[PDB]
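quick one, two chains, predict together pls
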Amino acid sequence: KKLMAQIFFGPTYYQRLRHMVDDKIHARARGPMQVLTRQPVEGRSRDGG
Amino acid sequence: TIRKDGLKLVGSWKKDPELRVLSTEEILNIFKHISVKDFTSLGFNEVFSRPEWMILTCLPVPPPPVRPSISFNESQR
């Protein structure tokens, strides 16, 4: 069916930015602990909390 | 009149000036002679903190858990 409103429509230049979700998703139940304080390590690269 | 010059207390006795460094030995001795009533009026406690315990004569050494050797060189401590 026809849309009751007419749509603004046309080509436009878009950039893909460096921030993707697959580089940011991170979850941790249990894993490595810090040697001094016996607390979880820091950062998703180290499976941190 | 007592001032501090770095980590040491220098006393200038008004001339009865005599400037000299107060040895921690004599400060400890004069702290140990303070009566219980005197230093309990100064805020100290007879059981948990006497003034003469502010002078260090025996250092407690923490166990290795306090100061661990986190060797990351995979061979060198």
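Residues 39 and 73 of chain B are 53 Å apart (CA to CA).
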